CSV table of C-alpha atoms in Angstrom, one decimal:
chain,number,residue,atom,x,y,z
A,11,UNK,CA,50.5,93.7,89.0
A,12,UNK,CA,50.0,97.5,90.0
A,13,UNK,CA,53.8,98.2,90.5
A,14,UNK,CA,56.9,96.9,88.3
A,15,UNK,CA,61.0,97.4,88.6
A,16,UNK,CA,63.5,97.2,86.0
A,17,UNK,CA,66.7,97.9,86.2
A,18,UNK,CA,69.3,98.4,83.7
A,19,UNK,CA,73.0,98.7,83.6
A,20,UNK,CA,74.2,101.6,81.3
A,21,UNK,CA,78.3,100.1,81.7
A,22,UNK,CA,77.6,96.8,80.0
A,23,UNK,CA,74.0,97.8,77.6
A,24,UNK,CA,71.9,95.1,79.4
A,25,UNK,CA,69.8,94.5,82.1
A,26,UNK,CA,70.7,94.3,85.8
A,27,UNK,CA,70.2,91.1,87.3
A,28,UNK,CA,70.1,90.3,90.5
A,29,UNK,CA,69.3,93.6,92.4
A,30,UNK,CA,67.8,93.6,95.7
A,31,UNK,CA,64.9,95.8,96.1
A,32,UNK,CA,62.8,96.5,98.8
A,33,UNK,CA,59.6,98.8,98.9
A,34,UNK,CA,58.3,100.7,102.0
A,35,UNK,CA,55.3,102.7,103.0
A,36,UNK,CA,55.0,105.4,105.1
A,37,UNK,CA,52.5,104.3,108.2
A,38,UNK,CA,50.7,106.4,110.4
A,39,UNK,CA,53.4,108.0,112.3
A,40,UNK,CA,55.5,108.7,109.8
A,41,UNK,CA,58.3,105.5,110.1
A,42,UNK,CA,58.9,104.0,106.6
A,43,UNK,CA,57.2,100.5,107.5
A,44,UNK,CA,58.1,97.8,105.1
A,45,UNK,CA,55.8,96.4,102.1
A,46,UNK,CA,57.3,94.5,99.8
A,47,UNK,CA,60.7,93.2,98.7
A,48,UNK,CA,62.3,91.1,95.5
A,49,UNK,CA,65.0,90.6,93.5
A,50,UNK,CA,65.5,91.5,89.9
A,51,UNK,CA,65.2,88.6,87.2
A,52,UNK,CA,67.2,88.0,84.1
A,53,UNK,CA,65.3,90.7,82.0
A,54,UNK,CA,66.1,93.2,84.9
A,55,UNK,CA,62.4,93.1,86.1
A,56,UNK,CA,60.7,92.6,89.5
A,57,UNK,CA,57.4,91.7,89.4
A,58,UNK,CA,54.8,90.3,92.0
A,59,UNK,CA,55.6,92.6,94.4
A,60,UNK,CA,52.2,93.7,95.5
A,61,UNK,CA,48.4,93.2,94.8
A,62,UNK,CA,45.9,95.8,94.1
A,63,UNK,CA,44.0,95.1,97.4
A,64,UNK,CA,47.3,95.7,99.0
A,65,UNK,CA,48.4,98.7,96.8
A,66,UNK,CA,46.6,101.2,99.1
A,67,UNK,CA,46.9,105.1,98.5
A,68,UNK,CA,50.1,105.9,100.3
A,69,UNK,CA,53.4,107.7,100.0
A,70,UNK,CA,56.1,105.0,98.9
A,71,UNK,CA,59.9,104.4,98.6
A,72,UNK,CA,61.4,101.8,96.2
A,73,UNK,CA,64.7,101.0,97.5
A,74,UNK,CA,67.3,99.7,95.0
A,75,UNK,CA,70.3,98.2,96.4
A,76,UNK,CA,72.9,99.6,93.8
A,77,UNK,CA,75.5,99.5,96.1
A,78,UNK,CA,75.9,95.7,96.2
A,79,UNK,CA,75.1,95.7,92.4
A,80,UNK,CA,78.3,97.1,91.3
A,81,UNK,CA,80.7,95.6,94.3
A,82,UNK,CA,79.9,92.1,93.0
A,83,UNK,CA,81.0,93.3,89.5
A,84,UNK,CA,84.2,94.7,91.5
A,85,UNK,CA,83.2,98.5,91.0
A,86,UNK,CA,83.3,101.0,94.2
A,87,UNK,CA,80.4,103.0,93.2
A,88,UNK,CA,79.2,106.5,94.4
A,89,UNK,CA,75.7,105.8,95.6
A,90,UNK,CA,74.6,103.7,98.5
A,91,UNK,CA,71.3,103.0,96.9
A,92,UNK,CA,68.8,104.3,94.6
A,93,UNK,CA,65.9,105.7,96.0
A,94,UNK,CA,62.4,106.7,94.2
A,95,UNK,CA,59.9,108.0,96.6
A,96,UNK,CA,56.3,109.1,95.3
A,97,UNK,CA,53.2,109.1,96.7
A,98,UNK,CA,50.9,106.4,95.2
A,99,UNK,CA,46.7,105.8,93.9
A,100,UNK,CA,46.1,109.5,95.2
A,101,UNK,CA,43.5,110.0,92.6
A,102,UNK,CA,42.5,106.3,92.2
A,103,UNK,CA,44.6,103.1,91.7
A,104,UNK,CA,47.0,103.2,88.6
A,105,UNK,CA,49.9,100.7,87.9
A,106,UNK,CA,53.7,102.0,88.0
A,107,UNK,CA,56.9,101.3,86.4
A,108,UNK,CA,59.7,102.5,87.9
A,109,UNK,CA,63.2,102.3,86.0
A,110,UNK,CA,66.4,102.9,87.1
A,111,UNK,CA,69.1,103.0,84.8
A,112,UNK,CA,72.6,102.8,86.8
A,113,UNK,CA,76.3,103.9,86.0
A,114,UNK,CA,78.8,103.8,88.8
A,115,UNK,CA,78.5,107.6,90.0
A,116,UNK,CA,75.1,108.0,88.4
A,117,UNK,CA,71.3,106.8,88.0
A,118,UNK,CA,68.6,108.1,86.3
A,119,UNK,CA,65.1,107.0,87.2
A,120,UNK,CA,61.7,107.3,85.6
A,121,UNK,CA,58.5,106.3,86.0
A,122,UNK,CA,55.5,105.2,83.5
A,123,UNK,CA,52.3,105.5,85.2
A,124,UNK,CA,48.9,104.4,83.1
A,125,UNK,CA,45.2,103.7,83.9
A,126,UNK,CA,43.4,100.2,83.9
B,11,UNK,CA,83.3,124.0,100.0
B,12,UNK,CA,83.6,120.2,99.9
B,13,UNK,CA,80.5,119.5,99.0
B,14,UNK,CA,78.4,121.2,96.6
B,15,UNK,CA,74.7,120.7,95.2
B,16,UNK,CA,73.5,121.6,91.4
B,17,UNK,CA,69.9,121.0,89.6
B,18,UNK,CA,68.6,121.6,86.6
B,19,UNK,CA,65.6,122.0,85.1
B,20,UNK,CA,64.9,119.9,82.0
B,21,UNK,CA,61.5,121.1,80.9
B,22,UNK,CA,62.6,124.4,80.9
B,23,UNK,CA,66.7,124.2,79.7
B,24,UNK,CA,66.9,126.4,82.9
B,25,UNK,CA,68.8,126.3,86.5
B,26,UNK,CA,66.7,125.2,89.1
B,27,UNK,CA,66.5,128.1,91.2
B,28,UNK,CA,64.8,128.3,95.0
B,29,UNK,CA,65.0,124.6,95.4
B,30,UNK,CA,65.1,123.7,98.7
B,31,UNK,CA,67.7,121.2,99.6
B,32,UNK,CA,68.2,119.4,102.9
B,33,UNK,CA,71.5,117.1,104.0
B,34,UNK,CA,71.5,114.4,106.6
B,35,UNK,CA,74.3,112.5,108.4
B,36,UNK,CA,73.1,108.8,109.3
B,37,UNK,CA,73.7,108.4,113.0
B,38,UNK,CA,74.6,105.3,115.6
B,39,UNK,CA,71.7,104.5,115.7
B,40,UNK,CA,71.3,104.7,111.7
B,41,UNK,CA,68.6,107.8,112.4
B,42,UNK,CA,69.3,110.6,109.7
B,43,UNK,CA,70.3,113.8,111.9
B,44,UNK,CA,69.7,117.4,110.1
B,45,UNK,CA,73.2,118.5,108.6
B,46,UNK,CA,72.8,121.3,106.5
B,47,UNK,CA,70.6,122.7,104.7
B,48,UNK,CA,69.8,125.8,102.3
B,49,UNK,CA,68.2,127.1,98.5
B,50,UNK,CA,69.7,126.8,95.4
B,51,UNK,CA,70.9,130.0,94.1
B,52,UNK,CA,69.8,131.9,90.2
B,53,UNK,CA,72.7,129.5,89.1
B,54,UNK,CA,71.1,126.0,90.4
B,55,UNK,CA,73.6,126.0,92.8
B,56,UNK,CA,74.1,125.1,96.3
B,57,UNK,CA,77.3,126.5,97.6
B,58,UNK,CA,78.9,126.5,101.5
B,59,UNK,CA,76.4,123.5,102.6
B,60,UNK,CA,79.7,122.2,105.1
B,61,UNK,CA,83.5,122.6,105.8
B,62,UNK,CA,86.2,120.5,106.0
B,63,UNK,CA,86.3,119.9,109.5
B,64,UNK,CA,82.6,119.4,109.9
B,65,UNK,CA,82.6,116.7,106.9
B,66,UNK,CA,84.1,113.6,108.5
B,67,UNK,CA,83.4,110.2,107.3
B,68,UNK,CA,80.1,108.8,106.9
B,69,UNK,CA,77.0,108.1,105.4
B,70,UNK,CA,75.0,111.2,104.4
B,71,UNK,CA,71.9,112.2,102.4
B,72,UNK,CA,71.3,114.7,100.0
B,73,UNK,CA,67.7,115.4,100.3
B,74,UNK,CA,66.0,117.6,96.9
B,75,UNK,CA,62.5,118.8,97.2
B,76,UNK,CA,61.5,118.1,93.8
B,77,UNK,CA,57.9,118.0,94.4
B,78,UNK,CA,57.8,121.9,95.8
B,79,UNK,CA,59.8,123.1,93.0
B,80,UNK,CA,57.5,121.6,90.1
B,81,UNK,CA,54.2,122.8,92.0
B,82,UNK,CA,55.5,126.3,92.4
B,83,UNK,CA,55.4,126.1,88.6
B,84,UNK,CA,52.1,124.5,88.4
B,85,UNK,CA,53.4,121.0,86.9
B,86,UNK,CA,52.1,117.6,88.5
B,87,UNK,CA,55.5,115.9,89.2
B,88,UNK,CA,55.9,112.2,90.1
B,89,UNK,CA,58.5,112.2,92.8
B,90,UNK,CA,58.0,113.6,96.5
B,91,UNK,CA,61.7,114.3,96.6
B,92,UNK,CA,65.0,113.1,94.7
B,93,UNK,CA,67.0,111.2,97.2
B,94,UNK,CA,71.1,110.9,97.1
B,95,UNK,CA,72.7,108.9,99.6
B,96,UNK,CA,76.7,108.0,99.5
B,97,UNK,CA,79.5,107.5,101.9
B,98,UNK,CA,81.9,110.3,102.1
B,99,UNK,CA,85.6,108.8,102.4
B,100,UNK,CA,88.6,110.7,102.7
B,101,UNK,CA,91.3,108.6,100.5
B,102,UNK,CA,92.6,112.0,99.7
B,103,UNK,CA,91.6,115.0,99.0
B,104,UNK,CA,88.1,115.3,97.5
B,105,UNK,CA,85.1,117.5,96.5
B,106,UNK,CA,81.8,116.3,95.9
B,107,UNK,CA,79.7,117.7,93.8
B,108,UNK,CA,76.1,116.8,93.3
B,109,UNK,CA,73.8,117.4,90.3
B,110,UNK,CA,70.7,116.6,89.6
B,111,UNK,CA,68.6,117.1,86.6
B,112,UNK,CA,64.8,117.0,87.1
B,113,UNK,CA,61.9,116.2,84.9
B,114,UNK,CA,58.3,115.8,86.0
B,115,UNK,CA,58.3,112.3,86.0
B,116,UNK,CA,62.0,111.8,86.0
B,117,UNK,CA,65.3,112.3,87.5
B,118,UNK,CA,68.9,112.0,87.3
B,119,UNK,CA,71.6,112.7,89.6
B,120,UNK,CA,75.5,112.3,88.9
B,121,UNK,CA,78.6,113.3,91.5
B,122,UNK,CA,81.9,114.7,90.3
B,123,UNK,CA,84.3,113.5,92.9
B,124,UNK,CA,87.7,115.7,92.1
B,125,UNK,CA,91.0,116.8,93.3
C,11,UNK,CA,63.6,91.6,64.9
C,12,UNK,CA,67.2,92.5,65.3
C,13,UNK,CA,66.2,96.3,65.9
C,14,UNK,CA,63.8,98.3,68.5
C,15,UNK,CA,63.3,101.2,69.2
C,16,UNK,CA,61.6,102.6,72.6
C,17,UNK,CA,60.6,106.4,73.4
C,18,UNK,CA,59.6,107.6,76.6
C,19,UNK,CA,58.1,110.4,77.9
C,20,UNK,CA,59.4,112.2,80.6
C,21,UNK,CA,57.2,114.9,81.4
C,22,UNK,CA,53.9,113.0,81.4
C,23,UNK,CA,55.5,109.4,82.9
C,24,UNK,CA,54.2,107.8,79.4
C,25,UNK,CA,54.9,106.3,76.3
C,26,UNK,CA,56.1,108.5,73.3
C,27,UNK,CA,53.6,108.0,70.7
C,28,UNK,CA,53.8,109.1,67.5
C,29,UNK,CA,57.5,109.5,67.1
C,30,UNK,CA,58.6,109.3,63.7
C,31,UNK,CA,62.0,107.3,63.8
C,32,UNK,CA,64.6,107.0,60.9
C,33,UNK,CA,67.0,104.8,60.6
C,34,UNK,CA,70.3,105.1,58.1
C,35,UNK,CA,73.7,103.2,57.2
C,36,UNK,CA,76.7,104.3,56.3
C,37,UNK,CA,77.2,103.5,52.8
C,38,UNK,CA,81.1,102.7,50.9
C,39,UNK,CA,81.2,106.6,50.1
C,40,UNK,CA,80.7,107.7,53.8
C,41,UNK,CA,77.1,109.0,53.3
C,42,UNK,CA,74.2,108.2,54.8
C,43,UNK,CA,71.8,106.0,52.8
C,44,UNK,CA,68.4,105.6,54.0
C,45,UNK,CA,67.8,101.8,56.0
C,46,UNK,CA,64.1,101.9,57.6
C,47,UNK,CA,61.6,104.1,58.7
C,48,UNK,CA,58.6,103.9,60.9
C,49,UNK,CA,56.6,105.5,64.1
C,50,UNK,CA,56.5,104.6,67.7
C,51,UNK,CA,53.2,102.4,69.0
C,52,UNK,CA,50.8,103.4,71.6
C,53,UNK,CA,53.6,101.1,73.4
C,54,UNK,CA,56.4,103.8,72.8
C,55,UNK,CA,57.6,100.7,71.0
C,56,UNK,CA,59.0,100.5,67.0
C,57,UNK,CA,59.0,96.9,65.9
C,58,UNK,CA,59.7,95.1,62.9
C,59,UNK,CA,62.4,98.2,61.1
C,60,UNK,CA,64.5,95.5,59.8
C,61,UNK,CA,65.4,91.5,59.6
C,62,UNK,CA,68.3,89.6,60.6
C,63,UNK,CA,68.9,89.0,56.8
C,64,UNK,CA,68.9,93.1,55.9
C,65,UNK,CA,70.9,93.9,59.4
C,66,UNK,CA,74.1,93.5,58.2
C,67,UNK,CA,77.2,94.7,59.7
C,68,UNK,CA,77.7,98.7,59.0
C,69,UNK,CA,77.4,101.8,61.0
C,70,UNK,CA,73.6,103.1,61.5
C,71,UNK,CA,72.3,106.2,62.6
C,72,UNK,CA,68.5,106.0,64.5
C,73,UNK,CA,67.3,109.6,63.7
C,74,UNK,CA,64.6,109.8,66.5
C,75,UNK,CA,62.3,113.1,65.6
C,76,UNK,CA,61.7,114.6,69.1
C,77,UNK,CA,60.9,118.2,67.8
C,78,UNK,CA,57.8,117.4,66.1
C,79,UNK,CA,56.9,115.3,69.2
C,80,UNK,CA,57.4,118.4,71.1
C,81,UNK,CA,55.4,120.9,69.0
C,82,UNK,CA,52.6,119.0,68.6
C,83,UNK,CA,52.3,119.2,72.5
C,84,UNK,CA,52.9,122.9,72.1
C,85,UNK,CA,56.2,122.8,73.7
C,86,UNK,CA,59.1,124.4,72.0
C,87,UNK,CA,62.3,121.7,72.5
C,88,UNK,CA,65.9,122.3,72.7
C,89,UNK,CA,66.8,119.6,70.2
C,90,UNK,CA,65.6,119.2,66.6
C,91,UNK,CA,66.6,115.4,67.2
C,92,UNK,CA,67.6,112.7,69.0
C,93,UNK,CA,70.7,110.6,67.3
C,94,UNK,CA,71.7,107.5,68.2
C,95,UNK,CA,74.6,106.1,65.9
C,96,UNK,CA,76.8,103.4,66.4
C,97,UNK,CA,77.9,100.0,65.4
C,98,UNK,CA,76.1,97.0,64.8
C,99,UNK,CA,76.4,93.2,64.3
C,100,UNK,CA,80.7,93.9,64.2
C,101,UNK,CA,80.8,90.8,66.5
C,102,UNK,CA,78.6,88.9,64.7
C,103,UNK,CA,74.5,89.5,64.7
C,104,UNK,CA,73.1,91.1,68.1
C,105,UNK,CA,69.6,92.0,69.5
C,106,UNK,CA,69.3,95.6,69.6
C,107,UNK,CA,67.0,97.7,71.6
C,108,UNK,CA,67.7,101.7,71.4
C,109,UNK,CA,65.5,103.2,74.1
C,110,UNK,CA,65.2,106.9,74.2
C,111,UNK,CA,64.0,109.4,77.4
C,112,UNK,CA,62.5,112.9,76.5
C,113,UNK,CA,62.4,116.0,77.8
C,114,UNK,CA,62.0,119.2,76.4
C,115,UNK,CA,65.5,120.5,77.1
C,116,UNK,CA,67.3,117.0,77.8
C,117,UNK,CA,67.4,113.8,76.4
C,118,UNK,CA,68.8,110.1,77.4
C,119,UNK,CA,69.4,107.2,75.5
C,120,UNK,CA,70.7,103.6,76.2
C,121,UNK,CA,71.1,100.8,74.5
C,122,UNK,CA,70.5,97.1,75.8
C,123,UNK,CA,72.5,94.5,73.5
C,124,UNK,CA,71.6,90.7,73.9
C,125,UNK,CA,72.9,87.5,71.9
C,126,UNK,CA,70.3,85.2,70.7
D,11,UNK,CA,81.2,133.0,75.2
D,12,UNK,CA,78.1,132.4,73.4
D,13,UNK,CA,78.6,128.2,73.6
D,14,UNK,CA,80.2,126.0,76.0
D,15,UNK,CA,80.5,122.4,76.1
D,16,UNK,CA,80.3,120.5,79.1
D,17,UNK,CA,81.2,116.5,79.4
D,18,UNK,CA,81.4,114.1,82.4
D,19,UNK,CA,82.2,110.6,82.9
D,20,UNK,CA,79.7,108.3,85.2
D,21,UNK,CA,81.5,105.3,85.0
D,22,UNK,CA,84.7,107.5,87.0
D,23,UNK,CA,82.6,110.1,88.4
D,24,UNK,CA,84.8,112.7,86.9
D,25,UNK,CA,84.9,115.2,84.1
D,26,UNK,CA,85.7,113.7,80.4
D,27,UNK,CA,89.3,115.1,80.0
D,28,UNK,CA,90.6,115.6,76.3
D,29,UNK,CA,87.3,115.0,74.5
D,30,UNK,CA,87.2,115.7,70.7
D,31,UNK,CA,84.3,118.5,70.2
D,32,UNK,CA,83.1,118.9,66.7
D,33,UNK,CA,80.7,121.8,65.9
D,34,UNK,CA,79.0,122.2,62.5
D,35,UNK,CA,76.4,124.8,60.7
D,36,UNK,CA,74.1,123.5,57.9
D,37,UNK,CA,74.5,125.0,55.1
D,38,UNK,CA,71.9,126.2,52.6
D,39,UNK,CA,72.0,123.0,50.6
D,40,UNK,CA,72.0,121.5,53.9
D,41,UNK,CA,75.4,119.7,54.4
D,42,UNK,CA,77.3,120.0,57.7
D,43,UNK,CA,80.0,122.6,57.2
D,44,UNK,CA,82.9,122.8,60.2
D,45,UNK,CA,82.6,125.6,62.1
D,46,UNK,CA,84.4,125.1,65.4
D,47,UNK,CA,86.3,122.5,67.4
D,48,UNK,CA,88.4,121.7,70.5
D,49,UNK,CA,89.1,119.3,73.6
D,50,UNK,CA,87.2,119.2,76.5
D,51,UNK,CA,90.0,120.5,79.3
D,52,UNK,CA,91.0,119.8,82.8
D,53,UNK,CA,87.3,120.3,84.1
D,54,UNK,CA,85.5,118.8,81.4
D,55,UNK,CA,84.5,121.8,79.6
D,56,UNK,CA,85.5,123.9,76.6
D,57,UNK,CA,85.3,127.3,76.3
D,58,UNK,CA,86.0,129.8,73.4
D,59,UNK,CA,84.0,127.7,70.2
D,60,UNK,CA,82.4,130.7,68.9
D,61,UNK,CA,82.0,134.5,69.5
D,62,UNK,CA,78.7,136.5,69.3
D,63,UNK,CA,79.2,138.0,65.9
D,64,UNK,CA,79.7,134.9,64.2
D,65,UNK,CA,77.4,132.6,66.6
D,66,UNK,CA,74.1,133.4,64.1
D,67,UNK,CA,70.9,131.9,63.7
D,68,UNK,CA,70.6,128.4,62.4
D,69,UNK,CA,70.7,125.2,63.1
D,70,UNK,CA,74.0,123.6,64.7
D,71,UNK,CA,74.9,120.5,65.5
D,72,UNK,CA,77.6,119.3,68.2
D,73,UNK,CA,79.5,116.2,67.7
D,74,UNK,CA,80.9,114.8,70.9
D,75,UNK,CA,83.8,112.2,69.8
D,76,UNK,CA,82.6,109.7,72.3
D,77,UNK,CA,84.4,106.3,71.4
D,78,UNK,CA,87.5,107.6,71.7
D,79,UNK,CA,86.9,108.6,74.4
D,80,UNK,CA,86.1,105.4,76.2
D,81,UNK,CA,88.5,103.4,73.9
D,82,UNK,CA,91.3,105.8,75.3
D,83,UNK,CA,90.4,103.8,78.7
D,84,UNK,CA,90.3,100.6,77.2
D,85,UNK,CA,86.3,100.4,77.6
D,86,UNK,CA,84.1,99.1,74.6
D,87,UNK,CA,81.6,101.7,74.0
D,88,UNK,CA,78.1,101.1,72.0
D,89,UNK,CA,78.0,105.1,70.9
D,90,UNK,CA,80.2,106.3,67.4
D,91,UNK,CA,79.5,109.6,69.0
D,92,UNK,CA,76.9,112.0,70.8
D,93,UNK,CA,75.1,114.3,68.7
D,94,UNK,CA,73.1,117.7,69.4
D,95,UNK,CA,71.7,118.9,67.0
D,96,UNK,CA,69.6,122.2,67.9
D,97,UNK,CA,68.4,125.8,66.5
D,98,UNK,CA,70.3,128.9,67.7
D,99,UNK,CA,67.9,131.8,67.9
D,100,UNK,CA,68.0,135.4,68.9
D,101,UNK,CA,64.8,136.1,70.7
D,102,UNK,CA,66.7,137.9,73.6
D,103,UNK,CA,70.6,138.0,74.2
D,104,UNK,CA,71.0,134.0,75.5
D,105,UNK,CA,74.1,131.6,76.4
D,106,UNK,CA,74.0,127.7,75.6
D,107,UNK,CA,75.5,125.1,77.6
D,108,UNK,CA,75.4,121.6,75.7
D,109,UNK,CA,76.3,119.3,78.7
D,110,UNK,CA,76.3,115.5,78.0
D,111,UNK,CA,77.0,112.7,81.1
D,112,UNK,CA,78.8,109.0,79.4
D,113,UNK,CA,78.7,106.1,80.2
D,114,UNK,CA,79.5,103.1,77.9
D,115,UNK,CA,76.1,102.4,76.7
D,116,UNK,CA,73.9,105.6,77.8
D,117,UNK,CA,74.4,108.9,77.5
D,118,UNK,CA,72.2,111.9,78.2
D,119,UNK,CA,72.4,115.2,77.1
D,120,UNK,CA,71.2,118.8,78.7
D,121,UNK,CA,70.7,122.7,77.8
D,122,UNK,CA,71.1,125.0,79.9
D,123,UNK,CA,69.7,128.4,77.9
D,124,UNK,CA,70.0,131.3,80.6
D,125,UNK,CA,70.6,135.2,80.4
């Protein structure tokens, strides 16, 4: 698949399981319109989300719902979400990792971006 | 002076200076309405964004534009923007301070939420 | 293996390859004696350092050379290294991976910890 | 004035309060010798390691006394410590700010090299 999540927890040194994400594209007009939408596995990553038919140039935003994350583990955490927005197959399709690594008042997010 | 914005520059060990930064308050009808807004200074920072009186509880987003700041320096950057969102609460007196420190293809932000 | 090690890129959104990685333990007389040694994949990845057998319990230091990385890109770094010491297998024998985020002036590391 | 060490907490979203620092210089047979120390204060930072004169070229290393740090909070840490390890050099009068962000199994570290 062109575009991959994983998530890990930097409190307990393993991945975070569970996390809701959902991706959106920016349509025509501007609106965020939605596109795609998972939850993280046991490894921490969320695959499947899209094809490469479907992964059209386009400026995206990957939605991670950190929030819920750590209030299910009992911790009041800073962020409402984690948000990576970058625009996508400008200069012909690639694939995408996006990682988030999360701490209750901080991420960190990177992405790995190679050719087929 | 309760809330305060701060990046950095990781490629070049630098503060990240002229870097635009717009805030957002999330509306009734959960539209993002224009806040505050201003450049970081030679030090990184953001200072005077809002007041106490103006910064009631809510949802608001800090808004970075990463993606002007790398091309001014002629780097291809990954992100259009770095994004922080959080609910300000008033369970006593608190400052927020956001940082941010930016890499091409990577970014992290922390708050310091004191006194 | 017992040990990985994973270096990433942060400036290019890529693998670290390359990246000569050396690994130490703490020996009875408090110095460092030398454990394994080896270089990062086209993956960013460094497999196979140890076994479960040779992992014992002890405190290791993964000397991650980032300044050569750096210079050989023609980019003058902050650090002369990335160090990552702690201690292992004090529970009984874990999986560990040490990943590792690079920047010129800044670097991250985690460490994900899993129980086979 | 020369060095300042900066430390911050992500798991409390807070500066790291009464954090050993540990500064060494290698020696010419290469062996860590002490050269300053202190705690992290109020803010998280520490001032005051070194002066100019004495702050010469060579290659330092910074030894942030992490576990006790989270073990003073009753949270298991993965990290012994977090180490910097960098070349001081003179090209131009310059300031360095080591600042390093914890958590219990991450930690990144920054320079800010400015003036």
């Amino acid at each position: 698949c062109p575009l991959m999540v994983k998530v890990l927890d930097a409190v307990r040194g393993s991945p975070a399981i569970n996390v809701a994400v959902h991706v959106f594209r920016k349509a025509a007009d501007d609106t965020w319109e939605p596109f795609a939408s998972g939850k993280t596995s046991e490894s921490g990553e969320l695959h499947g989300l899209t094809t490469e038919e479907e992964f059209v140039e386009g400026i995206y935003k990957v939605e991670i719902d950190t929030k819920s994350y750590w209030k299910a583990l009992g911790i009041s955490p800073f962020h409402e979400h984690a948000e990576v927005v970058f625009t996508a197959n400008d200069s012909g399709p690639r694939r995408y990792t996006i990682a988030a690594l999360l701490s209750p008042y901080s991420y960190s997010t990177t992405s790995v971006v190679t050719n087929p």
